[PDB]
């Protein structure tokens, strides 16, 4: 219900928590064909079986992705520079497909 | 107190370390081992990567 | 703190050999990974060799395979690409290239060569 | 070997991007690509490496992205101030080290 979901809400409205009570795994969005980037940077790429977290995700939503290269962190083009601010402390990984 | 002597004007240059090894090592052991570190996945024939 | 000098413009024959020297000195050579990469009057570049500065561990070209050795002096600092059985369609322009990519990591990055060396062409015209 | 859009031209104003196109096992592995700087006049300083970061010389109008089978860039408006060829240097792993591409010129009008 996560991840198979119907239809996106606008890009600024979104859960302002982390995921919770799971067996965290990395493995899907590797090993599925329907992911292709996945790139950790602070964090182990295969460091879920054993990393753990406090609050709860429900991010049920899909979205058309025809703005690639700027939904990305660090970036600038027609989306993420206003209605929507991409913050200077952000923390997490991104995944692309 | 000797940073005079050891120490070429272009740079000394013939002084060595080890930066990589699969293993920590033993008291008062000798590895003259020249194996190339293994840090990804594929390994190589004698190239880069 | 990055120098790098090539040799002038030349000119060769046919069947004949030059060992060419790409020149540096004064800095830590062992944190980078020096590649070498080529050009051509008018089209792209192409890579050739790789060079890690201790111990000369040696990779070559599939192009230039057979005609080409790798050698380096790191006594005094330096790195050759000698570039044998020079041939009739070798009129191009050719570079060296450095990485300055910090090589004490695990993770073979791209060289980060924010210098560039000068200039060369091994010419061969009749 | 990579293609890409050659050639183009262009006048100050609003985004516009290039892909370099490569294989599985080239796009795959390939997330070290970046573009050669190569500006008339000067050595092939690239001013790009590793898409995103920088060394000095650019501003922050080009992106770093990598788009399916192909290694993509976006700038705010390939313009009339960035004369420059560029060209993909894609770690292909399994392949040669890294071999190059079509070699987009970024030019002027």
């Known amino acids: 219900e996560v991840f198979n979901a119907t239809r996106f809400a606008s890009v600024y409205a979104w859960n302002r928590k982390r995921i919770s009570n799971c067996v965290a795994d990395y493995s899907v969005l590797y090993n599925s064909a329907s992911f292709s980037t996945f790139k950790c940077y602070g964090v182990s790429p295969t460091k879920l079986n054993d990393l753990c977290f406090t609050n709860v995700y429900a991010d049920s939503f899909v979205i058309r992705g025809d703005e690639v290269r700027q939904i990305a962190p660090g970036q600038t083009g027609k989306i993420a520079d206003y209605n929507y601010k991409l913050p200077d402390d952000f923390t997490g990984c991104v995944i692309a497909w | 107190n000797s940073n005079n002597l050891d120490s070429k004007v272009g740079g000394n240059y013939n002084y060595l370390y080890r930066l990589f090894r699969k293993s920590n090592l033993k008291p008062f052991e000798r590895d003259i081992s020249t194996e190339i570190y293994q840090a990804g996945s594929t390994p190589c024939n004698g190239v880069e990567g | 703190q990055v120098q790098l000098v090539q040799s002038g413009a030349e000119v060769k024959k046919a069947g004949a050999s030059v060992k060419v020297s790409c020149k540096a000195s004064?800095?830590?050579?062992?944190?980078?990974?020096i590649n070498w990469v080529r050009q051509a009057s008018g089209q792209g570049l192409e890579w050739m060799g790789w060079?890690?500065?201790?111990?000369?561990?040696?990779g070559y070209a599939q192009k230039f395979q057979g005609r080409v050795t790798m050698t380096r002096n790191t006594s005094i600092t330096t790195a050759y690409m000698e570039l044998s059985s020079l041939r009739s369609e070798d009129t191009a322009v050719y570079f060296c290239?450095?990485?300055?990519?910090?090589?004490?990591?695990?993770?073979?990055?791209?060289?980060?060569?924010?210098?560039?060396w000068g200039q060369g062409t091994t010419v061969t015209v009749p | 070997v990579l293609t890409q859009p050659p050639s183009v031209s262009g006048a100050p104003g609003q985004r516009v991007t290039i892909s370099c196109t490569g294989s599985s096992s080239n796009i795959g592995a390939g997330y070290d690509v970046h573009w050669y700087h190569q500006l008339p006049g000067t050595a092939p300083k690239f001013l790009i490496y590793?898409?995103?970061n920088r060394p000095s010389g650019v501003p922050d109008r080009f992106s770093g992205s990598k788009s399916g089978t192909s290694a993509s860039l976006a700038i705010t408006r390939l313009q009339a101030e960035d004369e420059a060829d560029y060209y993909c240097q894609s770690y292909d792993s399994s392949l040669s080290g890294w071999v190059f591409g079509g070699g987009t010129k970024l030019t002027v009008l």
């Open positions: 004064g800095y830590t050579f062992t944190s980078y990974d």
């Open positions: 290239a450095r990485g300055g990519r910090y090589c004490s990591s695990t993770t073979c990055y791209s060289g980060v060569g924010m210098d560039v």
């Open positions: 060079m890690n500065p201790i111990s000369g561990n040696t």
């Open positions: 590793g898409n995103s």
